[model samples]
Target: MREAEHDILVDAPADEVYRLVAEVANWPRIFPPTVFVDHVERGTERIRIWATANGEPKNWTSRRELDPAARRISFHQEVSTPPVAEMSGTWIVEPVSAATAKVRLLHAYRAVGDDPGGLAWIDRAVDTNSRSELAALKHNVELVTNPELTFSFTDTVRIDAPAKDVYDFVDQAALWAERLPHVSSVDLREPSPGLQVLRMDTRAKDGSVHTTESVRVCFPHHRIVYKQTTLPALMTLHTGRWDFAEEPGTTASSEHTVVLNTANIAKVLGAGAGVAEAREFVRTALSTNSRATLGFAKDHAEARP
Candidate 1:
């Protein structure tokens, strides 16, 4: 068996660190390399996380036992993919001070044939992933320490379709360039199962175009959340969520799907930009695109068989 251990000290609260690490679903947003995390079974102490490992997608069902009092989570992978015959790890958060914490990541694995090359590859991947995730967790936790400056609103529509069908229409973002009228081009990558990195150009009502880059974390038949890394001239940060709820029908043919889009805006267009003006600009811009997208999705989903 091969083993690797890495640790980092983050200048943040232990509880905060623990919370971020323990919540596997947040991995896509908080961890750079984690493209997607889907919990097939979220039992109290075990989970099946389907995620991308360093740009190569893989699904692993693991049993994790968390000790909140000890600030630790230990896990073993019951099912794994190629090159990896077995894998287990632990995350331990130790408080260095009242405001600082030390995060330790430990992993042990073995190759299918005890191949040296496979072992080396696993070592490098694990090391890189662990370091990036820890550093990202620290950065996010520290950056959000102060209050956020933002505004948000939601636009929703009900469709005559299953929640799963509605989710699929929204989740297949790569097709938007061809499906949506305003979209000019789209570059999408799903390095993991339910996670995506997308960059697309959209034509405004005035015929002008703007580009956006975003990371989307999707929960099938439930919700999809995204954070924009590259925004328009008037915004510094943009985040959005798509929630799909199923409404029981009086008959099987009457089932309905409720899809909602919530958009949050942060920062102003420029240094001297007035809050009032910025708020209105953001509200209109976000709402316009959101409604358009939702309407399209609703129509397409409802029209499907």
Candidate 2:
């Protein structure tokens, strides 16, 4: 088996660093190469992650056990795709000072013996992925020191339609351009049943245009979670989820649609922008878009025969 390890010294609390690493659900937003993560079994710490390696898509399932007190976590792959025969890793956070922590990542894996080329591929991937993750973690943790660089909010809309109908409206994102006034165009593809790649241009309330690229994991009528693969200049990371909740004891008669948006900012107003100005910018952008989307969805679902 080949082994690789990488570490970075982050100016952040050890507990924060450990929490950031242990929460695999946030990896798609915090790690550059990771596009999506789905927790298949939280009780057992089993998760499936999708990422890009050497410019190619890859996915795997792993079981992670977290040791919060020790500031470490261990993971072993139960199902590895392609060249990887076995894969396991550990994350360790050690305090360097009161406000500094060293985050280390270690990986050990063996490629299928028959494929020498595969071995090389796996090695390159491990090296590249580890470096990218560590660097991103450092930047994110450091940026959090400035509260202005972080944002989280939720928007919700009640619909007089079935939960499944509202969910289908969001799932069939390719139809958004034609159905929603704010969407100019949409290019959506589903390589796997529940996994989607979507690139779309949305027109904000001010008529400004921005192109967004994202990978979404759809859980049918339950939720549609997404992470931006290409982030805008004002943000380092953006992740969101759309949830469909059925009315209690009501069979498809009514539902509530909620959207949660989180942005890890890379810039704030003052130098070129104000803190309040920057905060409002992010909040307005996300809330406006979400409200428009949900309103349109509610109308469409209710109007459907």
Candidate 3:
């Protein structure tokens, strides 16, 4: 058995810090490595988490016990994945002062058959994920003061086709450079099935081009979630999801959540642009592309010889 403790000081109230960690729904949005998390048993708090550990996609079922008073949460894996026979952890959030808190992530694990190399691999992933979770916690907590900077909007289209066909239109994004008028070039790579890295350049109305790289997690015939790792000048964070639902006919929806880049608003949107203007600009640009894609996707699916 091996144990590791990783901690970081966050300049936020202990309760707030604890709240962020305790909320599993925020995992995909705040934590870079967490791709998806869903409850297995709602009342018991058993959850199934899908996350990238050291660039590898891995998933497991775990139960979390929340102690709001102590500002701590205890978690242990029930169905451990490969290279991991057993795993357990605790998140301890302590109040350092009124405006500051210290978060400690403690873990204990056993590798598959206790193999030396497996243990090392698990250890590396633990450290990397812990650091990322802590730093993101701090960044997000600090940014809470400016909630207006982050906003979201969604666009939807109806198609008289199956969900799988619509999913294919969104999933085969490598062909987007050719299929999408706004896309100039695209490079896509998937090291693991359902996980993709998409790098592409997009053309704006002014003919100026911006490059973006995104991490995508796809669920066959239903949903695709993506977060932009390389953002445009106008935004700091961009995450979106494509949902395909069969409402007799397929109703495809694209939802986007954005955090405005206050530092670059003037550069991207002209010196006269204010926060409201910046928000409108981003909303317009994003939806324009989404509508175009949905239009084409509709055509592609509805076409028949």
Candidate 4:
């Protein structure tokens, strides 16, 4: 089998590091230019898609199974290719300290053709790819900095629960992962509480999944904004924001608005899509994602004892 393995120490806890790796979309932010995740399919186990190498927008989908309690994950690719006929891997997490973690990634895959000469080729390629990708992941997550997103697309919602109850949910944003869907984890950094180190793995409208980050939060008012901050080599940056506002004179209810603005984010592609359509695209995305998120948050919060 063609195999690739690498290890890195991340200056974060096991849960934190595992959260990032398990969340697939976040890969685009940290992976080397050779690889980019298009979208993920959400299930108890996720399906991550890797874009084909020829620069075509094609994707190679893989099934990823994670064991949160054990801090381990196993993956298997569902594609047929010359270099790789089948692929499987495991990620093992070790907590070096209360705040630091050591991670080991290992993958084994067989080549499609039976040419024995390809063994050397597979080994060399896997080693180089794994080494490069792991290094990028380590640097991006460990040296993480001011990752934030800001958006102008606004979508609205109303919560039937008391404003205090809703505000309480907003205030306790750190617990978002446990209370909402798509949110994989939330970590509050030292020095600035307003700056939240976040990891979110969400299922898109197409039931595809995306793991993304750089969340900046403003509380009680129930607002958070984020933008893509890592993987500078790939040049894809996206921004989004969440807002919760109580309706005037309505003591028991609140209106929440979410905005997802994608102005300069896609600029790297040089295809503008014109300013007008871009606004509409963001608005539509904001409206769709926000409603699902609101449903997720509202249902979870109210169901709590």
Candidate 5:
């Protein structure tokens, strides 16, 4: 069968590289965004995933057999109903040095209608998208960046209440536990006009969740800031800020501003980039915690409680 493949030497271990590939759910956050992965059904012998690639959405169902002893993983496509009628691939991870390894990715795909043949035709479009993403992935993993443990986002809101009323709601650390059922606990430190420190625990429907610590550089009745302090377990860090303004004419209406930045540095360190990168990891961990800091602010000030 015709196939497409690429190989590169890595600065990490074989198992590490294999782990990243096996975990399909980690792709959106790990891989460059050129390919946005949708649903991932991970199973014992086979896995299915939906993704948008080459400007088209496609579904890939691959049967895989993992050989740990050989440090190799093989996958065979059984069916492709839509988007991609046929697709299959294999990945091989070889240990080359005590601290280095090599990874190879191979794939074969065909259209449902006509062969849609010609190396030049496919090369022009497919190659452009493929190479760009490949290069991005290589750089993302090969570089040295710290990774956090959870994904955090911050949002802000303005309330019609006075500064003291706003501060009163924010000051009651336990109020968050009641209003934001998703949040477990919150501790407010610097209780000033526009600044506050907080710690909280967050839970999601999926098994993934996080605990955060941050300083809410707030404006009491005006604005707030957030940054992370803890890493969940998978994400690197998420950071952002918020602004609040009172709406004119209406005493009950207010304006809110939100700014956010999100990123993961695991791929940057290749496979060896884990807890070992503690200091930088800690920075990311804290940044992630900072990211979720203002969500409660938005919820409390906006949600009808």
Candidate 6:
């Protein structure tokens, strides 16, 4: 068996650090490797997480125990993918001062059949992801201490077609340059199934173009979640989800959550522009293309006979 541990000092209260770690829904936002986390069972005891391990998308089901008294959460993999025979881990948040925490992440696991290569792969992924997760935890915890700058919104459109058809339009993002009116050029690479890196040059409402690159994790016919690695100057971070609902025809929704770059507000929009103005500017710019794409997807899906 192989065991590893990683720790980081967070400049946030122990309770805040613990709160972020305890919430599964926040994993995608706070951890780079994590793409989606869902409660497998009704309660929080069991969860299925879809995340990148060494840049490849893999998912597993785990049962977790939460101990708020000690500020610890433990997890054991109940259903792991290949290269991993078994896996378990614990997260402990210890108070260092009133506004500081020493966070430790521990993991123990073995490769399937004790294969050396498998073990090596797991080791690399664990170390890389652990470091990234910890750093992100600290950065996000500090960044969001004042949550007024982060906001989210969703826009949906109904289509009379199968969910798969709707999914295809979103999944085949490589063709967006040709299909999407607002997209000038797009470069998409999928090294592994369901994991995509998309770099796009998109036109704003005023015809000004900006560049963005995102990492996407796709679950066919259901959902696609992505985080922008390369963002526009006006926004520091962007994450979103594309959801397809099959019941009562098909509905496609585009959801976005963004952290605005407050420092760039005046430079990007205009001098004297504030957070509220920046908020509406971002909201309108993002939603325009989303609603347009949904309309196009709806037209294509419904027209296919």
lDDT of 1 by residue, 1-305 (tens): 98888888888789888987788755544564444455656565666554444444455577888889999999898877768888999999999999999989889998889988988888888888778877776765554442333445677777777888778877898899988999889999887677687889898877778887777777787787666655455544455678888876100111111111112223434455564655666577677777777788777877845
What TM-score goes with each of the models?
0.70, 0.85, 0.81, 0.47, 0.44, 0.77
Q: Report the C-alpha lDDT of model 2 over 216-280, residue by residue, as the tens digit.
A: 77887878877677766566667778888888611221111111223322243335445556567
What TM-score would you give candidate 6 relative to the actual structure?
Answer: 0.77
Winning model by TM-score: 2
Model 1: runs farther than 4 Å from truth?
50-59, 149-153, 158-179, 186-199, 205-240, 248-268, 273-284, 297-305
Candidate 3 TM-score, C-alpha based: 0.81
**Number of clashes in every candidate structure?**
0, 4, 0, 6, 16, 0
Best by lDDT: 6
- Residue-wise lDDT of candidate 6 within 189-262, one digit each (tens)? 88878878788888887867788778888889899988877667778778899999998599899999888888
Considering TM-score, which of the candidate structures 1 and 5 is the better prediction for this target? 1
Error at 18, model 4, angstroms: 0.3
lDDT of 3 by residue, 129-165 (tens): 7788788867766654366888889999999999999
Q: Which candidate would rank higher by TM-score, 2 or 6?
A: 2
Cα lDDT tens digits for candidate 4, 1-305: 66677898877788978887777645544453423343456664645443324223234577777799999999887775676667688898999999888889898877667567666677777788778767777766653321232123454556656555655564565677787666666654423454454545656666766655443433444555444443222223344456655665112222222222334546633575544554455456556756666666576446646
Whole-model lDDT, candidate 2?
0.75
Residue pairs in candidate 3 whose N, alpha carbon or C atoms collide under 3 angstroms = none
TM-score for candidate 5, please give it.
Answer: 0.44
- Ten consecutive residues with minimal summed lDDT in candidate 6? 50-59
By TM-score, the better pick of 5 and 6 is 6
Ranked by lDDT, top first:
6, 3, 2, 1, 4, 5
